[PDB]
Design an enzyme around this catalytic site. Structure first.
Site, PDB file in Angstrom:
ATOM      1  N   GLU B 259     -89.351  27.668 -35.485  1.00  0.00           N
ATOM      2  CA  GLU B 259     -90.788  28.484 -36.046  1.00  0.00           C
ATOM      3  C   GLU B 259     -90.532  30.161 -36.664  1.00  0.00           C
ATOM      4  O   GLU B 259     -90.907  30.462 -37.701  1.00  0.00           O
ATOM      5  CB  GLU B 259     -91.285  29.280 -35.107  1.00  0.00           C
ATOM      6  CG  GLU B 259     -92.388  29.575 -34.388  1.00  0.00           C
ATOM      7  CD  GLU B 259     -93.592  29.944 -33.239  1.00  0.00           C
ATOM      8  OE1 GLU B 259     -91.886  30.479 -32.360  1.00  0.00           O
ATOM      9  OE2 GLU B 259     -94.061  31.331 -33.115  1.00  0.00           O
ATOM     10  N   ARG B 290     -96.691  29.390 -29.141  1.00  0.00           N
ATOM     11  CA  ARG B 290     -96.695  28.039 -28.749  1.00  0.00           C
ATOM     12  C   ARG B 290     -97.657  26.899 -27.838  1.00  0.00           C
ATOM     13  O   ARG B 290     -96.948  25.836 -27.981  1.00  0.00           O
ATOM     14  CB  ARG B 290     -95.110  27.454 -28.699  1.00  0.00           C
ATOM     15  CG  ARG B 290     -94.409  28.855 -29.016  1.00  0.00           C
ATOM     16  CD  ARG B 290     -92.395  28.110 -29.272  1.00  0.00           C
ATOM     17  NE  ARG B 290     -91.651  28.917 -30.643  1.00  0.00           N
ATOM     18  CZ  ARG B 290     -90.539  28.381 -30.029  1.00  0.00           C
ATOM     19  NH1 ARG B 290     -90.242  27.660 -29.199  1.00  0.00           N
ATOM     20  NH2 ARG B 290     -89.848  28.760 -30.739  1.00  0.00           N
TER      21      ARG B 290
END
Ligand SMILES: Cc1cc2nc3c(=O)[nH]c(=O)nc-3n(C[C@H](O)[C@H](O)[C@H](O)COP(=O)(O)OP(=O)(O)OC[C@H]3O[C@@H](n4cnc5c(N)ncnc54)[C@H](O)[C@@H]3O)c2cc1C
Ligand SMILES: CCCCCCCCCCCCCCCCCC(=O)O[C@@H](COC(=O)CCCCCCCCCCCCCCC)COP(=O)(O)OCCN
Ligand code: HEM
Ligand SMILES: COC1=C(OC)C(=O)C(CC=C(C)C)=C(C)C1=O
Ligand code: SF4
Ligand code: F3S
Ligand code: FES
Lengths: 239, 614, 136, 101
Positions: B259, B290
């Site tokens: 990420e 997330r």
């Protein structure tokens, strides 16, 4: 449709079978119902054909080096080695070269790890009372020195390809452990760089390397252990 | 069974069952303190799934911009969806600066800034000025190889102390007597010998249970071994139902695309080449929780915007980032992408799909790592038992983990276990005399599995549960299907007695090590599928279509002055304590209240539950 | 640790564990054969020099006598221009590889793409020089 | 002490020394240059063979013996080289002669 079946000659040896002698078993694996790399054929043979094939696996992306073996004559992480889709060949899966085998493909790496422990792979500071209180400063130019060096996954692919580690692996440390020693030596924050060198002043620890450079080619991670060993030698000469 | 297996008894001051980041930090802490520690690992320490962790540690060190740890605390609390323990969240966010400092003082090669300090970046869920502000820069990254450098630094740094590693030993069960823990009984994989590492304080740092699902970013060794040792000892688990499905996992391999890449500028695009992260996250955009991002990506294909040849994945665009940034901060995902997806990050976008990534649940601990019981509605500490890392649920993550908080979790709570042990015990405490047949049931099970002639192979009971959980406990859930899944799982559990193994040797019997890992995976799956079926709300990563609302003791959307405080038995803001009768395989579910009072009420007041809209 | 290494060897030497195959299975990288042939050409050159100094001390007569001894049995313009090449190719090869290894000692040219250009260069200059030397 | 790095260096010096001492033998032959070339080749060869031994003769008992017989082969090769130089045409002339036919 029209299955593609590749042959895999794999080095077998069972420690519990009395009198078992190392042999090569062949397993025709269908290349359509399996992944692209070699570890996918091995995991398929283990889950669908012969549930006694022993090998080390953990990540399946080449970030940890547990699947190090000798595929087709080259020490390469099996999880990142593509299967040769040329179905007129027989992949020769073999354990790391010149290393005692626990079972089939699993080498006894405990001397490799003990040698890694012997080089003291940790930061040493002369004054350790200020440990953990302040961010040790290090420039971006002095941090670039450790690139290509701190990314070792300790897969032994390089050490078990070095002819000098085969002969004198009792006393020679090998390219992986030496590369790490180097890494530590040139860490801008380390304060034992003239004492990490001193430890290599015997005829065997460092000076069994004769630049065969058979460690830089086999490195699955594209690192360069033999240039490290060369830098170490230039540091051992020009203190 | 019996003397076909002579048992080698060891006596240590402390045993750590794990050598990941959390286990290594805890073993290093105990050994450094002085305790005679023993790390029991089933993988060489630097082989641990920690290595797969591109993405730095969160820490409010103010290098890029003035930052405070209280903003990190707030961020955490909010992202957890108010199901996290604001006391462990307080401890963690407060100790994160000093933990990353001690980690850099060990040699961890953190990327440096123009002034020579740790280079931090920006992840999804972070903010400034208690949200009101913008994206923050707190992620102390080691140049896209943070987990690898963490594991290698901690391992080599524990070589400095008398940490007696038991490498490639499989821990089978805890040695529980009179409610306390006296250590573990383990299996040497090399020669098949049974070992009883007795101790005075056990730290269970075994990682998660991601292999319960068909597609996972996790390693082959994430089989929920410590969670199942806890289940088989009579102790509960907690919030198992919550399973984070990281949004950016390779479509085919399931590998991780960091990420961080997004935090650098990367964007998510559907078949229409639009940044759908705006319709959903008008501020957070790509860098969001997330759980929101994963469900949104699912709610792009669900409606037919999949940009795949088979229309089953979206693209992640990075070529709009300069090549120098692509290769200077993200050197690892370049290799990964090329060697697997064949995608060149500098040219074409990477195919990405939500796959199981993190398990917020696990062993219920407090902020000190001490494993908790629940007796008559009270939290009782199991003596001599600690847990840390992904295996534990201190509920610093609650319903949803923020990115980069898991590596921080490992270091901060490995430190917490070590510090609590060195304040509660002295090095040298005489291990009580354990009974002479402790851990017999573990050896008899290992035997019953080594000579387990049956019908169903161990690879087939895995694929069976893995696909029953991939179909019935996926990103979106619905009672009508969570009950079909509960049924299927209970039945496959029953079928754990019809197992067939082929390898009957003792040396490196990986058919045994894997039937044992399947006995652990079926215990983590039973509990996660039952806690998920029972939880009649939608919170964090647990998203149910037939109950699309987060139920709390109040309706926090509305003013809470005239509201009636819903009783604990009605609202769903409570932890799911799960138990499994290991014989019958029936899962009883209790419920524990979320700890809201922080460590110092004056320092940082409890953050009231609010509408978690990004 | 020392104890761990002593225990590895005490356990594996005395066990029944086999040692995995190595030189047979391992493919021969060019520079590996270029280093084994540098050790072979060195032992060879040293053997030569040594038996020539021993000869010098024991063998009776003069070098010009043994020279004309071999000259007497005329061999021709081809056996001479081949025996010279076979007698100087080890020396040339060695000397060039020597300079390669000295360059490597200064830590230069130690990137894979370069060990093969160095290889080719060395072998070329080996032949080229050998001939030229034996065309004198 | 620095007895392994001092060796490594002393061997690289001798190597480059020989490297320069061979062609200059052709450019301008001399008897003193014969003697220096004899000592060069006998020290380079003694150290090289030393390395070979160290690599292949395992066992500290046998190793010392092999190195002593090697220091004797070398202490006699140098003797014969100097003898020949003083009592015959020398290495330069000898070579040239054998390379005349
Ligand atoms: C692909 C991937 C990428 C990630 N990237 C990031 C990131 O960028 N940032 C971040 O903050 N987090 C990241 N994470 C999450 C985080 O790194 C992990 O949750 C963390 O490494 C888990 O720590 P752990 O030590 O508890 O478990 P692990 O690191 O997996 O260690 C578990 C240990 O327990 C041992 N063990 C297990 N069972 C047994 C048994 N029965 N007997 C003996 N030993 C046993 C294993 O051998 C191992 O040593 C990532 C996770 C994955 C999968
Ligand atoms: C230690 C004794 C070794 C004897 C070597 C003879 C046989 C080995 C052949 C290899 C060496 C000879 C090839 C080198 C080219 C010779 C060219 C030549 O004849 O020119 C000069 C050669 O003589 C020299 O001065 C240099 C001699 C160098 C010899 C170095 C030998 C060292 C090691 C040899 C061992 C080889 C063993 C090989 C075994 C496989 C002579 O001078 P000139 O008359 O041409 O003109 C100069 C002034 N006008
Ligand atoms: C002409 C210039 C020469 C150069 C530059 C040179 C260089 C080298 C180098 C660099 C090595 C490797 C040392 C080690 O392994 O680390 C070596 C090895 C060796 N050389 Fe030479 N050499 C030359 C000539 C000779 C000659 C004429 C002889 C004959 C006596 C000789 C004999 C040896 C031996 C016996 C070895 C040891 C083999 C081995 O260690 O690999 N060399 N040389
Ligand atoms: C270049 O490195 C190598 C050697 O160096 C001297 C070898 O001896 C050997 C083994 C050969 C012999 C004759 C011992 C191999 C395989 C090798 O790769
Ligand atoms: S250096 Fe290259 S090959 Fe050698 S051990 Fe580390 S990664 Fe594996
Ligand atoms: S291959 Fe071996 S001989 Fe040296 S250069 Fe690498 S360690
Ligand atoms: S499996 Fe971890 S490196 Fe191949």
């Amino acid at each position: 449709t029209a299955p593609r079946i590749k042959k895999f000659a794999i080095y077998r040896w069972d420690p519990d079978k009395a009198g078992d002698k190392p042999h090569m078993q062949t397993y025709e694996v269908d290349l359509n119902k399996c992944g692209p790399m070699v570890l996918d054929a091995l995991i398929k043979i283990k889950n669908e054909v012969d549930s006694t094939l022993t090998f080390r696996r953990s990540c399946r992306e080449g970030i940890c080096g547990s699947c190090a073996m000798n595929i087709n004559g080259g020490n390469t992480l099996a999880c990142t080695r593509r299967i040769d889709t040329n179905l007129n060949k027989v992949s020769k899966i073999y354990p790391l070269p010149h290393m005692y085998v626990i079972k089939d493909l699993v080498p006894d790496l405990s001397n490799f790890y003990a040698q890694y422990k012997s080089i003291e792979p940790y930061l040493k500071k002369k004054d350790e009372s200020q440990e953990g209180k302040q961010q040790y400063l290090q420039s971006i130019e002095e941090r670039e020195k450790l690139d290509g060096l701190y990314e070792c996954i300790l897969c032994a692919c390089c050490s078990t390809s070095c002819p000098s580690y085969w002969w004198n692996g009792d006393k020679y440390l090998g390219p992986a452990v030496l590369m790490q020693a180097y890494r530590w030596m040139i860490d801008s924050r380390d304060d034992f760089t003239e004492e990490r060198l001193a430890k290599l002043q015997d005829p065997f620890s460092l000076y069994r390397c004769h630049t065969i450079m058979n460690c830089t080619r086999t490195c699955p991670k594209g690192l360069n252990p033999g240039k490290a060993i060369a830098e170490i030698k230039k540091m051992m000469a020009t203190y | 069974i019996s003397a076909q297996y002579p048992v080698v008894d060891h006596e240590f001051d402390a045993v750590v069952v794990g050598a990941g980041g959390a286990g290594l930090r805890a073993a290093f802490g105990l050994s450094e303190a002085g305790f005679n520690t023993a790390c029991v690992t089933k993988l060489f320490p630097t082989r641990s799934h920690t290595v797969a962790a591109q993405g730095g540690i969160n820490a409010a060190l103010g290098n890029m911009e003035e930052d405070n740890w209280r903003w990190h605390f707030y961020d955490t609390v909010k992202g957890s969806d108010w199901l996290g323990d604001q006391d462990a969240i307080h401890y963690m966010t407060e100790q994160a600066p000093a933990a990353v400092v001690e980690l850099e003082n060990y040699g961890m090669p953190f990327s440096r800034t123009e002034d020579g300090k740790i280079y931090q970046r920006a992840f999804g869920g972070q903010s400034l000025k208690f949200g009101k502000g913008g994206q923050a820069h707190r992620c102390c990254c080691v140049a896209d190889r943070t987990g690898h450098s963490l594991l290698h630094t901690l391992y080599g740094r524990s070589l400095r102390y008398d940490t007696s590693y038991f490498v490639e030993y499989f821990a089978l069960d805890l040695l529980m007597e009179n409610g306390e823990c006296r250590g573990v009984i383990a299996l040497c994989i090399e020669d098949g010998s049974i070992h009883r590492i007795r101790a005075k304080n056990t730290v269970v740092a075994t990682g998660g249970y991601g292999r319960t699902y068909f597609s996972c970013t996790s390693a082959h060794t994430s089989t929920g071994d410590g969670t199942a040792m806890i289940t088989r000892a009579g102790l509960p688990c907690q919030d198992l139902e919550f399973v984070q499905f990281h949004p950016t996992g390779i479509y085919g391999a399931g590998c991780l695309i960091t990420e961080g890449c997004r935090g650098e500028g990367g964007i998510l695009i559907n078949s229409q080449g639009e940044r759908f992260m705006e319709r959903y996250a008008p501020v957070a955009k790509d860098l969001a929780s997330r759980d929101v991002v994963s469900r949104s990506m699912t709610l792009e294909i669900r409606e037919g915007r999949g940009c795949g040849p088979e229309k089953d994945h979206v693209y992640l665009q990075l070529h709009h980032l300069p090549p120098e940034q692509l290769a200077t901060r993200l050197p690892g995902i370049s290799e990964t992408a090329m060697i697997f997806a064949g995608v060149d990050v500098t040219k074409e976008p990477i195919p990405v799909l939500p796959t199981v990534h993190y398990n917020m649940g696990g062993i219920p601990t407090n902020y000190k790592g001490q494993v908790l019981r629940h007796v008559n509605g009270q939290d009782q500490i199991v003596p001599g038992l600690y847990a840390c890392g992904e295996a534990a649920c201190a509920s610093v993550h609650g319903a949803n983990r923020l990115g980069a908080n898991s590596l921080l979790d490992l270091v901060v709570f490995g430190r917490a276990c070590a510090l609590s042990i060195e304040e509660s015990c002295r090095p040298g405490d005489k291990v009580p005399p354990i009974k002479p047949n402790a851990g017999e049931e573990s050896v008899m099970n290992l035997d019953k599995l080594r000579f387990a002639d049956g019908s169903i192979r161990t690879s087939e009971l895995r694929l069976s549960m893995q696909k029953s959980m991939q179909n019935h406990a996926a990103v979106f859930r619905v009672g009508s299907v969570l009950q079909e899944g509960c049924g299927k799982i209970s039945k496959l559990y029953g079928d754990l007695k019809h197992l067939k193994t082929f390898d009957r040797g003792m040396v490196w019997n990986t058919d045994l090590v894997e039937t044992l890992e399947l006995q652990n995976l079926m215990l983590c799956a039973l509990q996660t599928i039952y806690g998920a079926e029972a939880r009649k709300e939608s919170r964090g990563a647990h998203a149910r279509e037939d109950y699309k609302v987060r139920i709390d003791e109040y309706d926090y959307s509305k003013p809470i002055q005239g509201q009636q405080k819903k009783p604990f038995e009605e609202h769903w803001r409570k932890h799911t304590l799960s138990y499994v009768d290991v014989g019958t395989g029936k899962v009883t579910l209790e419920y524990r209240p979320v700890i809201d009072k922080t460590l110092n009420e004056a320092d940082c007041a409890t953050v009231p539950p609010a509408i978690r809209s990004y | 640790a020392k104890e761990e290494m002593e225990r590895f060897w005490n356990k594996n030497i005395g066990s029944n564990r086999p040692l995995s195959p190595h030189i047979t299975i391992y493919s021969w990288s060019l520079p590996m054969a270029m280093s084994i042939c540098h050790r072979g050409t060195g032992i060879a050159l040293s053997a030569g020099v040594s038996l020539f100094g021993m000869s010098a001390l024991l063998l009776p007569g003069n070098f010009e006598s043994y020279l004309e001894l071999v000259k007497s049995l005329c061999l021709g313009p081809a056996l001479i221009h081949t025996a010279k090449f076979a007698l100087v190719f080890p020396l040339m090869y060695h000397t060039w590889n020597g300079i390669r290894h000295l360059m490597w000692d200064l830590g230069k040219g130690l990137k894979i793409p370069q060990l093969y250009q160095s290889g080719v260069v060395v072998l070329v200059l080996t032949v080229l020089s050998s001939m030229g030397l034996a065309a004198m | 002490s620095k007895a392994a790095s001092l060796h490594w260096t002393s061997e690289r010096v001798v190597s480059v020394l020989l490297l320069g001492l061979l062609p200059a033998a052709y450019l301008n032959p001399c008897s003193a240059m014969d003697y220096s070339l004899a000592a060069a080749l006998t020290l380079h060869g003694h150290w090289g063979l030393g390395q070979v031994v160290t690599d292949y003769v395992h066992g500290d008992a046998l190793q010392k013996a092999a190195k002593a017989g090697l220091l004797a082969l070398s202490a006699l090769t140098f003797a014969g080289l100097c003898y020949f130089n003083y009592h015959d045409v020398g290495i330069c002339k000898a070579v040239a002669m054998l390379w005349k036919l």
